Short mmCIF file of C-alpha atoms (C1' of nucleotides) in Angstrom, two decimals:
data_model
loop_
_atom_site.label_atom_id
_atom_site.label_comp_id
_atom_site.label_asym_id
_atom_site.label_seq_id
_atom_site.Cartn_x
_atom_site.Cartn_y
_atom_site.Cartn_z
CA UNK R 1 0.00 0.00 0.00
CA UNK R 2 1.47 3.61 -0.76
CA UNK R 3 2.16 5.76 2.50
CA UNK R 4 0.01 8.99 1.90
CA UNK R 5 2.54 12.01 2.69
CA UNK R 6 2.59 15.59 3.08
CA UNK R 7 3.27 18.08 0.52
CA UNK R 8 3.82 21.66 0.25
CA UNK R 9 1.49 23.74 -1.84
CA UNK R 10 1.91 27.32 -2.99
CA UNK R 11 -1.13 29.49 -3.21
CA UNK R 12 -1.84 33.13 -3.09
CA UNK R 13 -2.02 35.81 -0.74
CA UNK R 14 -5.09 35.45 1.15
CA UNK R 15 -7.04 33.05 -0.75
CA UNK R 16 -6.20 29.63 0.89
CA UNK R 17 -9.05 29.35 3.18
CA UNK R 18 -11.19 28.53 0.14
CA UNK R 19 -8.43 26.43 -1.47
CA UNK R 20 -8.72 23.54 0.73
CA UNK R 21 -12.31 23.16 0.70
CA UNK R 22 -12.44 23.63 -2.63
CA UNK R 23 -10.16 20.89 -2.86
CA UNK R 24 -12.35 18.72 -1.16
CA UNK R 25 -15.09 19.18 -3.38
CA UNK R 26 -12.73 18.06 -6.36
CA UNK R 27 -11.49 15.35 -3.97
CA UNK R 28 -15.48 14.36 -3.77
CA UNK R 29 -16.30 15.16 -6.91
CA UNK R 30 -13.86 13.31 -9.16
CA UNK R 31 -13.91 9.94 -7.35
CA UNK R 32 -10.28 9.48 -6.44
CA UNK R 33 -11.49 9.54 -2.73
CA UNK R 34 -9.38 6.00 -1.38
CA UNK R 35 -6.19 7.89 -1.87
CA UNK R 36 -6.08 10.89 0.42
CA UNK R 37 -5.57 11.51 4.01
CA UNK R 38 -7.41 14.59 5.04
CA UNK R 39 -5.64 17.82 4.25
CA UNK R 40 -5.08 20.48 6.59
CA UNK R 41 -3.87 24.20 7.52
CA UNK R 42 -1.93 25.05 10.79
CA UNK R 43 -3.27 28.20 12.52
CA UNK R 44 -3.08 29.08 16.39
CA UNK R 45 -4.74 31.84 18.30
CA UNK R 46 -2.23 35.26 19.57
CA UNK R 47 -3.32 37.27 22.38
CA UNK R 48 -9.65 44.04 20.11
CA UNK R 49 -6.24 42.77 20.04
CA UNK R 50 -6.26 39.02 19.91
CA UNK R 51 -6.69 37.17 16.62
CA UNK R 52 -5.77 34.06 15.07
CA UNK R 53 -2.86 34.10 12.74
CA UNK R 54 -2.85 31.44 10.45
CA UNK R 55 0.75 29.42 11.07
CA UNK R 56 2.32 29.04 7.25
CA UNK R 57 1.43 32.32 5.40
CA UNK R 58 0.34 31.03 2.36
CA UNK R 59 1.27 27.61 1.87
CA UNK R 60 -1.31 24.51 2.59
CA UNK R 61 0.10 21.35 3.62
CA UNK R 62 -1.30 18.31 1.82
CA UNK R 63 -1.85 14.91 1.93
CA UNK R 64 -0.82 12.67 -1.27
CA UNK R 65 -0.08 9.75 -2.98
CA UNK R 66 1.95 11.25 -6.16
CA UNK R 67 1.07 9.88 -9.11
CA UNK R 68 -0.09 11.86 -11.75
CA UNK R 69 -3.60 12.06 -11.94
CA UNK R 70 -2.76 13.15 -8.59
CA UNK R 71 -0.94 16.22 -10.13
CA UNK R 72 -3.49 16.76 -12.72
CA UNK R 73 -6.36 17.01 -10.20
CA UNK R 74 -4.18 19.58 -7.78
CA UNK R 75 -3.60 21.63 -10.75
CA UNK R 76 -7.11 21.92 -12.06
CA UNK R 77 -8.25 23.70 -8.85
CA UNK R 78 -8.84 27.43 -9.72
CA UNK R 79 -6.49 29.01 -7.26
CA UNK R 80 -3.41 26.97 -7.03
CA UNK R 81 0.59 27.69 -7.95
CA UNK R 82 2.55 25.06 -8.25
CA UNK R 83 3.77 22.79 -6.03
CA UNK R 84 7.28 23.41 -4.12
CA UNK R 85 9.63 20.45 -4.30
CA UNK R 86 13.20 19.56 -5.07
CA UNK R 87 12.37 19.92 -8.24
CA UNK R 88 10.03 20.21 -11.19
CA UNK R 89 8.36 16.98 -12.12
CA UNK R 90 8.43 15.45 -9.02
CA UNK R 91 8.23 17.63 -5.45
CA UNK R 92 9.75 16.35 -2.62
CA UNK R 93 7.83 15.02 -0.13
CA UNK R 94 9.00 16.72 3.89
CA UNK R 95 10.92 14.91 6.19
CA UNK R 96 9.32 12.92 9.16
CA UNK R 97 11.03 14.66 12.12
CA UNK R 98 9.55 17.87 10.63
CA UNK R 99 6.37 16.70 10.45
CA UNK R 100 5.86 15.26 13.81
CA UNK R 101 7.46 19.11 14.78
CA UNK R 102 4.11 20.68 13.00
CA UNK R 103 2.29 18.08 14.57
CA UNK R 104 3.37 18.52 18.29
CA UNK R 105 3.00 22.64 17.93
CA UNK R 106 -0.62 21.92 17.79
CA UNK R 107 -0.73 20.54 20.97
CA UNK R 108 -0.52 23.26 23.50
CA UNK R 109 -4.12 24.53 23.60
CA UNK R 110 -5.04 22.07 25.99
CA UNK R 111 -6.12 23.32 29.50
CA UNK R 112 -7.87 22.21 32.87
CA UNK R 113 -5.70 21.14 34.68
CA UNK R 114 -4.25 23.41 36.06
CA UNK R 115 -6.94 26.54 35.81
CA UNK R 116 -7.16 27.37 39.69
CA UNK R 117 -7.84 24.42 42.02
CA UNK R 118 -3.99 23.61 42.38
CA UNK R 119 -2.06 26.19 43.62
CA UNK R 120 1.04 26.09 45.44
CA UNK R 121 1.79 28.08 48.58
CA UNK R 122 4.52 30.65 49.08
CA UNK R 123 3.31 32.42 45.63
CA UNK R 124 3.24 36.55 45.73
CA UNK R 125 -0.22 36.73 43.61
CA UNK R 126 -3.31 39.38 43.32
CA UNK R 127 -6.51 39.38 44.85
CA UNK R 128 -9.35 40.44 42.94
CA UNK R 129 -12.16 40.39 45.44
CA UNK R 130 -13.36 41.88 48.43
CA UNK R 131 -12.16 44.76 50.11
CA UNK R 132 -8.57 43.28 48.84
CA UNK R 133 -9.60 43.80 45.23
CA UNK R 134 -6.24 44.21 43.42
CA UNK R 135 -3.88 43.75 45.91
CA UNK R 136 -0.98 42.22 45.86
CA UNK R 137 0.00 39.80 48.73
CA UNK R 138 1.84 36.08 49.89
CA UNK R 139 -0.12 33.49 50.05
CA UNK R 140 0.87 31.35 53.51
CA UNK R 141 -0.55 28.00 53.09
CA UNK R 142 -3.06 26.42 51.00
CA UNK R 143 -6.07 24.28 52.76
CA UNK R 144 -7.22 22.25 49.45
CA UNK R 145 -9.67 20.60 51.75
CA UNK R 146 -11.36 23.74 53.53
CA UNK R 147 -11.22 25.62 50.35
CA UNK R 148 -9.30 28.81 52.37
CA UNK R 149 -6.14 30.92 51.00
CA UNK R 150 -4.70 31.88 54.16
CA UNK R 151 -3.20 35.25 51.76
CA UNK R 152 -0.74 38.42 53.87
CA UNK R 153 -2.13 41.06 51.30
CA UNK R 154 0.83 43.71 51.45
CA UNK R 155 -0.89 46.88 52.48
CA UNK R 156 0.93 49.51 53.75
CA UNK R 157 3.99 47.86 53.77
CA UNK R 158 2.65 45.07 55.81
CA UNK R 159 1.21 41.58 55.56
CA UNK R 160 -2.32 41.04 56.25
CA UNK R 161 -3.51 38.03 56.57
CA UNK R 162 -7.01 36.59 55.50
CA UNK R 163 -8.74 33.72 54.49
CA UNK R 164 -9.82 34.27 50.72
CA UNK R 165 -11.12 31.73 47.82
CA UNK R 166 -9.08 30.36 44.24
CA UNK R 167 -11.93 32.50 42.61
CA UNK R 168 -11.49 35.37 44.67
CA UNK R 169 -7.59 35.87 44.18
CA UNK R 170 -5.44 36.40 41.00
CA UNK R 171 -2.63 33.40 40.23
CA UNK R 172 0.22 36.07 39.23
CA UNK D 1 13.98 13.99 -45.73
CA UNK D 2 12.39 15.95 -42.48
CA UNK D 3 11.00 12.92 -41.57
CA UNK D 4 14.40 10.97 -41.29
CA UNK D 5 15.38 14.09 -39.23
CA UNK D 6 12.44 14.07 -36.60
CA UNK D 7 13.52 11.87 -33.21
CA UNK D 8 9.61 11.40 -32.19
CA UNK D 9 8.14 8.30 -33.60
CA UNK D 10 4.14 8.01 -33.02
CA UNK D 11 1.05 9.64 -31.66
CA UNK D 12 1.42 9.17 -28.10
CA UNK D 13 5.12 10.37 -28.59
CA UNK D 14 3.78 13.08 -30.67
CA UNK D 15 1.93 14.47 -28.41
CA UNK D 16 4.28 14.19 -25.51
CA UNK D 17 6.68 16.03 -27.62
CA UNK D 18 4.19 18.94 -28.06
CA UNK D 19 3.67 18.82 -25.00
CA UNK D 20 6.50 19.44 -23.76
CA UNK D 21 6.86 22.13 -26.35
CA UNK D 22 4.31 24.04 -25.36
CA UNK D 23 5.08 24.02 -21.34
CA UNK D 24 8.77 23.16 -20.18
CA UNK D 25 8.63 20.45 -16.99
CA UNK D 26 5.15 19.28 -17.02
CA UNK D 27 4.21 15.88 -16.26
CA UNK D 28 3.82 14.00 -19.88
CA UNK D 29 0.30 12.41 -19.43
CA UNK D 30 -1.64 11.11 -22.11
CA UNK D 31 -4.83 12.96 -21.30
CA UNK D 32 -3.02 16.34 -20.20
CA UNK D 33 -1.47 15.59 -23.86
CA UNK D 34 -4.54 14.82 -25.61
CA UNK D 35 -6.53 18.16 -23.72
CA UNK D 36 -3.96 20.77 -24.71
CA UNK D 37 -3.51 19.19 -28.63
CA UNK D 38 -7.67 19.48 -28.38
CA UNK D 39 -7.62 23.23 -27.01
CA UNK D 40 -5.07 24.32 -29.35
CA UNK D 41 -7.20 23.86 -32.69
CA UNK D 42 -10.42 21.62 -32.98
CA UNK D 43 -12.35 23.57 -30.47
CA UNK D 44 -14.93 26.49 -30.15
CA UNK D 45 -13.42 27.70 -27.14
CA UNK D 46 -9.72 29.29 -27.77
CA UNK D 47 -9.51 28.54 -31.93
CA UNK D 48 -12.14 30.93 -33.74
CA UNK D 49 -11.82 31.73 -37.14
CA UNK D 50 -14.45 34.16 -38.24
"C1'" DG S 1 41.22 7.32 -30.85
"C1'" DT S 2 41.77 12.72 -29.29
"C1'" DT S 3 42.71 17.84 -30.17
"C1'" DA S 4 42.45 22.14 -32.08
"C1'" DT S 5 39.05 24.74 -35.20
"C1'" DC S 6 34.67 26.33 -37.84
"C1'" DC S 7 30.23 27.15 -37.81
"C1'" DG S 8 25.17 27.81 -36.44
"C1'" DC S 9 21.99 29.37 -32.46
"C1'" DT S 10 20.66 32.52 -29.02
"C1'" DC S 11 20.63 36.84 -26.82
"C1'" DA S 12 21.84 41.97 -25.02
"C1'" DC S 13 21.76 46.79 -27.00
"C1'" DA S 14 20.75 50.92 -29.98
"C1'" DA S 15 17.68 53.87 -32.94
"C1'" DT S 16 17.40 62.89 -33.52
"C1'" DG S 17 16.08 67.04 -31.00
"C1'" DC S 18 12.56 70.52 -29.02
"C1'" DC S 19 7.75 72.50 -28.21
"C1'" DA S 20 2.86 73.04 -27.05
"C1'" DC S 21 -1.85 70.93 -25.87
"C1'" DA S 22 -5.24 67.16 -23.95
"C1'" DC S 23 -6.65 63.14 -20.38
"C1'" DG S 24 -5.17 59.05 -17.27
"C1'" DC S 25 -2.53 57.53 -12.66
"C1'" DC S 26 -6.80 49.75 -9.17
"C1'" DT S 27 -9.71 46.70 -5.74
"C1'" DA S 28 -12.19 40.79 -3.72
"C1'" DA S 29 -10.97 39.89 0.41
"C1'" DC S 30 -8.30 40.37 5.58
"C1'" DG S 31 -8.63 43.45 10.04
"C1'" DA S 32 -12.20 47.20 12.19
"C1'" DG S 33 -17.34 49.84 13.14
"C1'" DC S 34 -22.43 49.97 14.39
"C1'" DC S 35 -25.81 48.34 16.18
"C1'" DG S 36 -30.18 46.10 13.68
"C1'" DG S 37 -32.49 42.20 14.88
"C1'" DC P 1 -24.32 40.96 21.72
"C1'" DC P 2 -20.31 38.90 17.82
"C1'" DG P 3 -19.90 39.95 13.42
"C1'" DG P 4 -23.90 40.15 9.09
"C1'" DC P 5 -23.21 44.02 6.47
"C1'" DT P 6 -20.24 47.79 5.59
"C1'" DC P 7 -15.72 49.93 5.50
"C1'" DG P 8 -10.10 50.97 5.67
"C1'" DT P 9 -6.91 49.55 3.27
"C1'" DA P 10 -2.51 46.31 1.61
"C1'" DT P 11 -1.59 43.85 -1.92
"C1'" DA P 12 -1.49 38.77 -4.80
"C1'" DA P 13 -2.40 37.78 -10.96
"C1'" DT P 14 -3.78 33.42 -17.43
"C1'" DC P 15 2.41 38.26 -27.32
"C1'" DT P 16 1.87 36.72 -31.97
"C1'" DT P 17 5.09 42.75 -38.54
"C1'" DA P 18 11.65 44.24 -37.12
"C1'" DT P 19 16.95 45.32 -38.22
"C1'" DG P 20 21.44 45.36 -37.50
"C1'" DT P 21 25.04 44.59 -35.03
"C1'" DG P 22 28.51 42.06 -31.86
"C1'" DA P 23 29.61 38.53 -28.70
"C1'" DG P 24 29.55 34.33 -26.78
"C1'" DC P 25 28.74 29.25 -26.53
"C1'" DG P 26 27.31 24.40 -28.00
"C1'" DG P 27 27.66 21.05 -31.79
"C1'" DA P 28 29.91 19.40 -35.81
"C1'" DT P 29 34.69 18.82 -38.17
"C1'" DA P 30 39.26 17.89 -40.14
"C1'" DA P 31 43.97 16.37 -38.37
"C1'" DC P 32 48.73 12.78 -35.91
#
DNA sequence: GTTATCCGCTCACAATGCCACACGCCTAACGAGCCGG
DNA sequence: CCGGCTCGTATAATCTTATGTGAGCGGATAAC
């Protein structure tokens, strides 16, 4: 059986979003469907001031088989330069360390744990809430089983202690 | 005499040597052959005489 | 053989000066704006 | 109540009647 692999595509400036879809419809369409692997585009999300920049700026990376009806259907898709490889004729397909690199950089969006119900103690952090809203102070211990922050809020140049919840406090 | 000079042989060779005339590095396929030798003359689309 | 020449193919580079006149010199889609439903 | 519309603007693409030069380079070409 052939190993589908991943090949670079050139495109335009900001028409790529439509590319790959478009692609699928072609992939759908012209019945060469037991051959492909599910093509893709890397983004990730920056932090109105946050957006999501799309990874490669236009390049998509696809999955193939190479031969050349393969070609032939890549090329007759409306927006699509030519492919990037060694050479004309035949593009060379990427390496495998590289692509289990672009595979592990999509792997950092994953949260809870730790959100706000581990925390350690001896942390200078904020607290958001109360009459200690945005304060800085040390926390002293954490009680994971009463639920209680025993934070020293620096005010004045001294601690203060108080008993204070995860939600209620600022991890900083 | 021209064709004792000519290297290509028959019509599948033919048209891979247009071809590759017409567009340096492209895949020769027969049917990407036998498309662009259609296009070029025996059709309405891009060949109008008047 | 192998070596020193001869010849055909392909490609960069030039083609007066001046005047008036006149009309021309982007936009389908990626980051913001308003607020209606 | 975020962007569907609407806008500010930054930026990517499938000829075809010429002549005369020189100058160089690849392919044939005639010898010890």
């Amino acid at each position: 059986a052939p190993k589908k692999r991943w090949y670079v595509v050139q495109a335009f400036s900001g028409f790529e979003g439509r590319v790959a879809t478009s692609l699928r419809e072609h992939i759908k369409l012209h019945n060469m469907e037991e051959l492909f692997g599910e093509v893709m585009v890397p983004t990730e999300e920056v932090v109105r001031r946050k957006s999501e920049r799309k990874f490669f700026p236009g390049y998509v990376l696809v999955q193939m088989v190479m031969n050349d009806a393969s070609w032939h259907l890549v090329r007759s898709v409306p927006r699509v330069m030519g492919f990037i490889g060694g050479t004309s004729d035949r593009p060379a397909p990427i390496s495998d360390k590289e692509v289990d690199a672009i595979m592990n950089r999509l792997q950092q969006v994953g949260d809870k744990p730790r959100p706000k119900t581990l925390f350690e103690p001896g942390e200078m952090v904020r607290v958001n809430d109360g009459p200690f809203a945005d304060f800085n102070g040390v926390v002293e211990e954490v009680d994971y089983e009463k639920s209680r922050l025993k934070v020293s809020v620096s005010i004045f140049g001294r601690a203060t202690p108080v008993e204070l919840d995860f939600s209620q406090v600022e991890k900083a | 005499e021209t064709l004792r000079v000519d290297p290509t042989n028959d019509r599948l060779s033919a048209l891979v040597e247009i071809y590759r005339m017409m567009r340096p590095g492209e895949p020769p396929t027969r049917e990407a052959a036998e498309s662009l030798f259609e296009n070029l003359f025996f059709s309405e689309d891009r060949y109008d005489l008047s």
